[PDB]
Each structure stands twice: as structure tokens, then as C-alpha cells.
């Protein structure tokens, strides 16, 4: 699925997006910027926190400038926060089972989905205030592993930047409460089909790399069928965190290595 959440503020979600905690099962963040706003502004690759915040603050590297310091405080919002998450068997899977290729996967899939979220992108301007389309989003995806509920959980923050580039100018993100024709609007209005869309696009991945699938929940809600999820469910230092899944898994009787030759073969 994918939930949706506005950022916190710019130190806030700096720290926190890529704090080595959130994601030391991973290893690392793989964290890389997307959107058409991102390229023209010259974003690719990986993230610097420093670009990053200053974004959320409303400050382009671009060199334009939405901050609207008010006594000490920024009446910019920095952005939204679109969290895509991968099915327990798959995430226990990509960081337990030491198949990388899942987690791939995983990004794929989220890139796949994160565009049809730009295409709503809109900005506001009057005339009468109209909501016209823009098609770009300035995006840093950042990828964590635990969950609130401590368990493994590959999913990708994709950090909208709160700014699009329309006629040349740099202006904020389209928002209406009232008509709900603002670009959040539409994302609300639309989590399901996304988060569809980036389940469907995984669960075709996963299936090429000779992994079966099942229906869990409605609107897609699978898991792979085998995978111990249950072991994970009802419920300090990322270290400790590691050890006790690795040692709850072990005391599953899966066989890891034989579950992924399964799947080799099943397709290869
Ligand atoms: C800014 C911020 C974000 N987050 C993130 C990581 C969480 O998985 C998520 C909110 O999801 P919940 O668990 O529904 O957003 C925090 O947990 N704390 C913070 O203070
Ligand atoms: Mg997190």
C-alpha cells in the first residue's frame, strides 16, 4: 500500500529520512532523487541531506526561493510523504532471505508508480483560482526496513518536494480543500489505485524471478505463499533487532536457501 503523510519540517525530516537506523537491516538507503523537476534542476543520484532540507526549507538549488520566515519559523510546507510498503513475505524475504534482487525489485515498482503520482501534479493561479496540471515533482526516495510494529518492512519514502516548475517560475504544489482538485487531493483520491499500481508492478517482477503468489486481501493484498510471515506478527539498538529476527526465523524450520532454489528453477 501507500500512505500518505505530510513532512514534518525540514531539520525534522532531514534526520529522520536517512537516519542509519531506519534502515540497518538494509545497509544502506538508496536514496536517488526522481521527477521531471529533478532533472531539470540537476538532482541525480544520491541525496544530500544539505540540497535535501534546504528543498523542504523551499529553497532551490535552482536558486529560487518559496521560504516564508514569519518570527523564526517557515510558513513553507516541505512536502508530502508517499510511503510504498512490500508485502511481509517480501520484505523478510529481500533483507532475511539475502535475495538483493527483491528489493530491486521493490525500487522498480516504486518508480513505476511515483510517476503517475507527478502526472497529477498541479499548481494554483488565479484569473478566479484554477487548478492547471504541470506534470513535474521534485522527489528524494529513501528506503527503510523495520516498522512501527518491528518488523521487517522494505518500504520507500518518496519525499514529494512541495514546489513545481510552471512557466518557468518555481511555484508550490496545488491545494484545495473545498473543489479537491489540488494535487493532494488527487492523491488521496487515488491511494488505492497506487498503491495497486505499485503492488502489480512487483508482484510481475517477482513472478519473473520464478516466485509464486497469492491473494491475501482485497485489491490485491498478496503474499509469497511459504514465507513464515505469521512469525512476524502480534509482536533498544538496530543490532539486537537483527539477531532476534534472524534467530525468530531460524526457529520456523523455512528453508531459505531452498525456497529461493525453488524458485531458480521455476523459471530461470
Ligand atoms: C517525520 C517523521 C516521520 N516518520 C515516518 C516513518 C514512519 O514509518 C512513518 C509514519 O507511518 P505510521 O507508522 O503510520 O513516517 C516517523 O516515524 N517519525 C517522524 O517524526
Ligand atoms: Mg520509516
Known amino acids: 500500500m501507500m500512505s500518505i503523510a505530510q513532512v514534518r519540517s525540514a531539520g525534522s525530516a532531514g534526520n529522520f529520512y536517512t537516519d542509519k537506523d531506519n534502515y540497518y537491516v538494509l545497509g544502506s538507503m538508496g536514496e536517488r532523487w526522481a521527477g521531471r523537476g529533478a532533472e531539470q534542476l540537476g538532482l541525480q543520484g544520491s541525496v544530500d541531506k544539505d540540497v535535501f532540507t534546504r528543498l523542504l526549507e523551499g529553497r532551490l538549488p535552482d536558486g529560487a526561493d518559496l521560504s516564508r520566515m514569519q518570527d523564526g519559523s517557515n510558513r513553507h510546507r516541505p512536502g508530502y510523504d508517499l510511503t510504498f510498503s512490500a508485502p511481509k513475505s517480501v520484505s523478510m524475504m529481500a533483507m532475511l532471505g539475502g535475495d538483493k534482487r527483491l528489493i530491486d525489485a521493490h525500487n522498480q515498482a516504486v518508480d513505476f508508480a511515483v510517476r503517475q503520482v507527478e502526472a497529477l501534479a498541479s499548481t494554483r493561479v488565479m484569473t478566479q483560482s484554477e487548478t492547471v496540471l504541470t506534470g513535474n515533482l521534485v522527489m528524494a526516495l529513501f528506503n527503510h526496513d523495520t516498522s512501527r510494529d518491528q518488523e521487517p518492512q522494505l518500504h520507500t519514502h518518496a519525499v514529494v518536494a512541495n514546489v513545481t516548475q510552471h512557466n518557468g517560475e518555481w511555484k508550490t504544489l496545488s491545494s484545495d480543500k473545498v473543489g479537491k482538485t489540488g ?64 534467530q525468530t526465523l531460524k526457529e520456523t524450520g523455512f528453508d531459505i536457501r531452498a525456497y529461493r532454489d525453488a524458485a531458480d528453477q521455476r523459471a530461470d
Open 183 to 246: 494535487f493532494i487531493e488527487n492523491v488521496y483520491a487515488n491511494q488505492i489505485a497506487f498503491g495497486r499500481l505499485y503492488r502489480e508492478k512487483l508482484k510481475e517482477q517477482v513472478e519473473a524471478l520464478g516466485y509464486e503468489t497469492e491473494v491475501v486481501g482485497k485489491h490485491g493484498m498478496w503474499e509469497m505463499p511459504g514465507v513464515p510471515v505469521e512469525a512476524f506478527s502480534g509482536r533498544v539498538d538496530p543490532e539486537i533487532k537483527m539477531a532476534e529476527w534472524m
